Amino acid sequence: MPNIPPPFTAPYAPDDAEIAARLLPASHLSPPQEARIHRTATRLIEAIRKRLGGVEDM
Amino acid sequence: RVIQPGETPDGTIGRLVKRLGAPAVRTATRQAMRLMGNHFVLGETIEQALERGKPGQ
User: Fold this and answer.
1) What is the DSSP code (8-state) at residue A56?
2) Which residue of A20, A38, A49, A56 is surrounded by the most CB atoms within 10 Å?
3) Hey, what's the signal peptide range on this chain (chain B) (predicted)?
4) Helix or strand or coil: residue B31?
5) Residues followed by a gap in chain B, C→N > 2.5 Å
6) What is the rounded CA–CA span in Å between residue A5 and residue A57?
7) A42: nearest CA in chain B?
């Protein structure tokens, strides 16, 4: 029911700093969020570093 | 003993675990075991080493 959007036409190459100015604050996470992330990610990498692998290994 | 979780990784092994992860350290330890078992003739006493390194050959 809403309108079909106009043809896509966002600016091609805007300034990185202006984008970083919005992305940096918004990426903030509480200590318990970061702690879960840290643990999950550490476990995944430990598993990665444990087969016969990939192109990268070759 | 009983190992409590969340232990700060210290020592040569702890620092190794923080760097490579516990699974790689286990894998590195098993390789060290093949090296120690194949390339050294060892015992608590010389009699045990010598018995171990025996081959009428």
Assistant:
1) T
2) A49
3) none
4) helix
5) 55
6) 46
7) B21
